[PDB]
Amino acid sequence: ETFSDLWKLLPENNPSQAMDDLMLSPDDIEQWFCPLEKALDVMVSTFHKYSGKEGDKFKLNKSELKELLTRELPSFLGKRTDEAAFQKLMSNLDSNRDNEVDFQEYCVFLSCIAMMCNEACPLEKALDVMVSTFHKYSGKEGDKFKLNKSELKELLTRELPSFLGKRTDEAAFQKLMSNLDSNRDNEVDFQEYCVFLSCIAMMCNEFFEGFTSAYTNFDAERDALNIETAIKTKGVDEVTIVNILTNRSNEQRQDIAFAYQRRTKKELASALKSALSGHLETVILGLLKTPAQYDASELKASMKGLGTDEDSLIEIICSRTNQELQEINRVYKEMYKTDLEKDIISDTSGDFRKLMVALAKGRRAEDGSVIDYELIDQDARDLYDAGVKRKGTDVPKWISIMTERSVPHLQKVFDRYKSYSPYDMLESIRKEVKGDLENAFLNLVQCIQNKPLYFADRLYDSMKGKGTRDKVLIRIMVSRSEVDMLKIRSEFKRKYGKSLYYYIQQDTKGDYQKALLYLCGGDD
Ligand SMILES: [Ca+2]
Ligand SMILES: [Ca+2]
Ligand SMILES: [Ca+2]
Ligand SMILES: [Ca+2]
Ligand SMILES: [Ca+2]
Ligand SMILES: [Ca+2]
Ligand SMILES: [Ca+2]
Ligand SMILES: [Ca+2]
Ligand SMILES: [Ca+2]
Ligand SMILES: [Ca+2]
């Protein structure tokens, strides 16, 4: 019973030392292809098991860290989860202030937990193993539970043997003993033990991180070969195609497509299109397309035809950011030899055309450091004066203020608008506009206020009725699996009482269900 003393007990966190003190040949560890070594491997792999789910593959976001704490660290229970004290713990783990926990502060956190208890399940087991290994030698010769130089040498020899080079002249061993002797007591305290384990883990990470990031046994040629045999089997092994494809990053899928094409001179996309059936074909082909390529193809689909798919166009042009939109524009010009803006102008008209065009330019101001309070208030009052206060609506003013301002500024703008208008921004949109413009504005504002909640809503909408709107469900499951899918699951389960996993289960069956569930990631 102690989560209440977990966001606080974490001191001033203060690799050079790792590879400098007792350097191990970079060629030695690169030509490099035991309970404590198993524990270190578990500690290092658990981090990447979550850091690579979304965004930066090497740092944890709040969602990823919450998932990790919940899955791998149920040892502490208390009042289940929280949101203020957990935010405090996330901010105390963030020594860099990048709003993300990287591997170094993750190691700081693990060291702090280990010092605490020094008085799934894998990682808890690794912590118990660290404590047990340290105190088996500490409580031997010399001070009780204080590593004496002799017992330190024994523990370093027959507990972590892999990291010791082939030759360990007594001079280098004593040099390492001295380097470890930070507190200058001639022995080793449990804190020095934890800092040494942190240095080893960070070395292992630098090996993993950067190059040879296939340390997760990722071989693109192996996957290409397995899926080629899965195509070339009786009735097609769709299970293996899914199990593999839908469990690699978009980049890993690019590498696998390249490997397949080099091995068979047939593009993986074409092979799986000619060898796949229906919605599973749609999921897989969307998963093969790179993000920008997928989005550009979806925009084209929504526009290419007699009419227009307002809903999908709206979703994509209102949920994509400036960088995403620039990449999408250029990929569009490549793929279809025409500008996305040109097709947007040719397929829509009026204020809806204006709003779509404006948003698609990806020229929204970037999130600034200063809060422009006077501008927040001026913009809220301008929105009120142009919409609810008057007869009619000044659509150009709304367009300007909602496409050009940043997102946090606009969130403040909306909370201020709530101070002048009795109807909030969504309600005011419903009251002042109609049709495609109204739907676009509702989407834009939902994206500006809470994008994971927005996608959780679109998913509930796709799955609540008779059957499914597989197009939308699939596009959200594909496009948000490596971005904010964890927060999407969080909001979905907050609002609708059941996990997105559960609604996927209930609405789709078969291998298509399994592909969607994999892209989901798990329950809740
Ligand atoms: Ca991440
Ligand atoms: Ca950080
Ligand atoms: Ca001792
Ligand atoms: Ca010392
Ligand atoms: Ca089959
Ligand atoms: Ca087909
Ligand atoms: Ca059209
Ligand atoms: Ca239409
Ligand atoms: Ca009006
Ligand atoms: Ca349904």
UniProtKB/Swiss-Prot annotation:
Keywords on record: Acetylation, Annexin, Basement membrane, Calcium, Calcium/phospholipid-binding, Extracellular matrix, Host-virus interaction, Isopeptide bond, Phosphoprotein, Repeat, RNA-binding, Secreted, Ubl conjugation
Molecular function as annotated in GO: cadherin binding involved in cell-cell adhesion; calcium ion binding; calcium-dependent phospholipid binding; calcium-dependent protein binding; cytoskeletal protein binding; identical protein binding; phosphatidylinositol-4,5-bisphosphate binding; phosphatidylserine binding
Localisation: Secreted, Extracellular space, Extracellular matrix, Basement membrane; Melanosome
Miscellaneous section: It may cross-link plasma membrane phospholipids with actin and the cytoskeleton and be involved with exocytosis.
Quaternary assembly: Heterotetramer containing 2 light chains of S100A10/p11 and 2 heavy chains of ANXA2/p36. Interacts with ATP1B1. Interacts with DYSF. Interacts with COCH. Interacts (via repeat Annexin 1) with PCSK9 (via the C-terminal domain); the interaction inhibits the degradation of LDLR. Interacts with CEACAM1 (via the cytoplasmic domain); this interaction is regulated by phosphorylation of CEACAM1. Interacts with APPL2 and APPL1; targets APPL2 to endosomes and acting in parallel to RAB5A. Interacts with S100A4. May interact with UBAP2. (Microbial infection) Interacts with human cytomegalovirus (HCMV).
Protein purpose: Calcium-regulated membrane-binding protein whose affinity for calcium is greatly enhanced by anionic phospholipids. It binds two calcium ions with high affinity. May be involved in heat-stress response. Inhibits PCSK9-enhanced LDLR degradation, probably reduces PCSK9 protein levels via a translational mechanism but also competes with LDLR for binding with PCSK9. Binds to endosomes damaged by phagocytosis of particulate wear debris and participates in endosomal membrane stabilization, thereby limiting NLRP3 inflammasome activation.
PANTHER family listed in its UniProt record: ANNEXIN (PTHR10502), ANNEXIN A2-RELATED (PTHR10502:SF18)
Protein name: Annexin A2
Native species: Homo sapiens
